[PDB]
Design a protein around this ligand. Sequence first.
Ligand SMILES: O=C(O)c1cccc(COc2ccccc2-c2ccccc2)c1
Length: 133
Amino acid sequence: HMCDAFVGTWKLVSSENFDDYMKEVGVGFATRKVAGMAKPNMIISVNGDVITIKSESTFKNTEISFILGQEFDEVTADDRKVKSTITLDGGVLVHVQKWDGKSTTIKRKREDDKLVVECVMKGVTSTRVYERA
Ligand SMILES: O=C(O)c1cccc(COc2ccccc2-c2ccccc2)c1
């Protein structure tokens, strides 16, 4: 029942500070503009020990599959090649991405009927709120 509170189909309803987060990450101007417009559908599923997160949007379609605690290689929507580890900490999915001696952490939590995504890169935080599709 791992991650049951997260499983389903979710749609972005609000974003704050995302352009600033993307700039801290190193995303270039054109990508930031187009990516910042996107309203993704996020699909989270669980099959045994394997979690799959898909993000579908007019910007990019991305999919990751992983086992908690077990590092994987991820190519991000903005084309970084990162090493990612996702863990469940106190009911929060914590996703750390490492590349070029940089790190960013994305946390996904359930709050009321929403799924709240917090993206942090050095001092800059963005909050993205999803509701059930
Ligand atoms: O809202 C999310 O599910 C979420 C989760 C985890 C991480 C991030 C951050 O991802 C991005 C990072 C850099 C540049 C662009 C993106 C990006 C922009 C639009 C759709 C998908 C990725 C968004």
